[PDB]
């Protein structure tokens, strides 16, 4: 019924392909997984999703040991491909994408789900350039029956992970996703990642902690979004800005055009 045309992206288990229906020509995204605990959890999370800034899940089909996960194709491609290396993108476009990213993350956190791997390759765009949070292979429950569960597993992508994930045995989920959103905002406004990892052995991270904002990528960023990044990229997660307070930030609320 479907023909595999091109690879769309990668992940820790299986692969995501562009599939074209042999009868209707309908183009969709399909995740093909070989061989059980991890896929059952992923399917469960994908079934919970219903929001404008999260990738739409059509359903799943099992054939022997092979699992197929059907998702709405993001015709605008990835946010990664909108970032010009060493430049970024126009500040109004970055602000709009950031507003949409916050909308999707508030939605996930509201249903007690943490994404755990927010980065430009996992942020896709529809026909009208609406951002959509994709890939739930690392996603997990951090709140159930109004009771929070601490995370105790290391995962994600090193330039995007919060420092507490490397240091603490257990840590709160929401500040970790807030942090990765801050690295995404830095990438959008500067076209470069600030550090390989948020550790003391990383000079670029030490330089940020020492407020050396006269260095790249910070010197490419205007004072208003930089003031927001100073509130997000806070080492101590208990002192880090929360999403309700990000929504009150001067740059977040600044009228911008084109
Ligand atoms: C230019 C071109 C060749 O015509 C494009 C590029 N496009 C896309 C779409 C997607 N999609 N769409 C849905 C979807 C769900 C999950 C994932 C994913 C990424 C990582 N893990 N899961 C990726 C997904 N990814 C990348 N590029 C559309 C084809 C436009």
From Swiss-Prot:
The active site is at 117 (proton acceptor). GO terms for cellular component: centrosome; chromatin; condensed nuclear chromosome; cytoplasm; cytosol; extracellular space; intracellular membrane-bounded organelle; nucleoplasm. One of its GO terms (biological process) is G2/M transition of mitotic cell cycle. Expressed ubiquitously with the most abundant expression in thymus, testis, small intestine and colon. ATP binds at residues 8-16, 31. Its EC number is 2.7.11.1. Activated through phosphorylation predominantly by ATR but also by ATM in response to DNA damage or inhibition of DNA replication. Activation is modulated by several mediators including CLSPN, BRCA1 and FEM1B. Proteolytic cleavage at the C-terminus by SPRTN during normal DNA replication activates the protein kinase activity. Keywords: ATP-binding, Cell cycle, Chromosome, Cytoplasm, Cytoskeleton, Disease variant, DNA damage, DNA repair, Isopeptide bond, Kinase, Nucleotide-binding, Nucleus, Phosphoprotein, Serine/threonine-protein kinase, Transferase, Ubl conjugation. Residues 2-252 form the Protein kinase domain. Phosphorylated by ATR in a RAD17-dependent manner in response to ultraviolet irradiation and inhibition of DNA replication. Phosphorylated by ATM in response to ionizing irradiation. It catalyses: L-seryl-[protein] + ATP = O-phospho-L-seryl-[protein] + ADP + H(+); L-threonyl-[protein] + ATP = O-phospho-L-threonyl-[protein] + ADP + H(+). Residues 1-252 are annotated as: Interaction with CLSPN. Changing residue 117 to A: Abolishes kinase activity. The keyword Cell cycle applies. One of its GO terms (molecular function) is protein kinase activity. It is found in: Nucleus; Chromosome; Cytoplasm; Cytoplasm, Cytoskeleton, Microtubule organizing center, Centrosome. Its main location: nucleus. Interacts (phosphorylated by ATR) with RAD51. Interacts with and phosphorylates CLSPN, an adapter protein that regulates the ATR-dependent phosphorylation of CHEK1. Interacts with BRCA1. Interacts with and phosphorylates CDC25A, CDC25B and CDC25C. Interacts with FBXO6, which regulates CHEK1. Interacts with PPM1D, which regulates CHEK1 through dephosphorylation. Interacts with TIMELESS; DNA damage-dependent. Interacts with FEM1B; activates CHEK1 in response to stress. Interacts with TLK1. Interacts with XPO1 and YWHAZ. Interacts with CDK5RAP3; antagonizes CHEK1. The autoinhibitory region (AIR) inhibits the activity of the kinase domain. It is linked to Oocyte/zygote/embryo maturation arrest 21: An autosomal dominant, female infertility disorder characterized by zygote development arrest due to failure of pronuclei fusion. Serine/threonine-protein kinase which is required for checkpoint-mediated cell cycle arrest and activation of DNA repair in response to the presence of DNA damage or unreplicated DNA. May also negatively regulate cell cycle progression during unperturbed cell cycles. This regulation is achieved by a number of mechanisms that together help to preserve the integrity of the genome. Recognizes the substrate consensus sequence [R-X-X-S/T]. Binds to and phosphorylates CDC25A, CDC25B and CDC25C. Belongs to the protein kinase superfamily. CAMK Ser/Thr protein kinase family. NIM1 subfamily. This is Serine/threonine-protein kinase Chk1. It comes from Homo sapiens (Human). The lineage of its organism: Eukaryota, Metazoa, Chordata, Craniata, Vertebrata. The gene is CHEK1. The chain holds residues 8 to 271 of 476 of the full protein.
């Amino acid at each position: 019924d479907w023909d595999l045309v091109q690879t769309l992206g990668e992940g820790a288990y299986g692969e995501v392909q562009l599939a074209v229906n042999r009868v209707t020509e309908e183009a969709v995204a399909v995740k093909i997984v070989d061989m059980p605990e991890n896929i059952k959890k992923e399917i469960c999370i994908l079934k919970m999703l219903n929001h404008e800034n999260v990738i739409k899940f059509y359903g799943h089909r099992r054939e022997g040991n092979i699992q197929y996960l059907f998702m709405e194709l993001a015709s605008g491609g990835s946010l990664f491909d909108r970032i010009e290396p060493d430049i970024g993108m126009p500040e109004p476009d970055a602000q709009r994408f950031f507003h949409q990213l916050m909308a999707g993350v508030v939605y996930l956190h509201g249903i007690g789900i943490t994404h755990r791997d927010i980065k430009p390759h996992n942020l896709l765009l529809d026909e009208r350039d609406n951002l959509k949070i994709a890939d739930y292979s690392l996603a997990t429950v951090f709140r159930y029956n109004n009771r929070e569960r601490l995370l105790n597993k290391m995962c994600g992508t090193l330039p995007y992970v919060a420092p507490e994930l490397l240091k603490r045995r257990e840590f709160h989920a929401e500040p970790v996703d807030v942090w990765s959103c801050g690295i995404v905002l830095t990438a959008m406004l500067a076209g470069e990642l600030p550090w390989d990892q948020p550790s003391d052995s990383c000079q670029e991270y030490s330089d940020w902690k020492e407020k050396k904002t006269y260095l790249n990528p910070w010197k490419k960023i205007d004072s208003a979004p930089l003031a927001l990044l100073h509130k997000i990229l806070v080492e101590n997660p208990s002192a880090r800005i929360t999403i309700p307070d990000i929504k009150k930030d001067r740059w977040y609320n600044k009228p911008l055009k084109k």
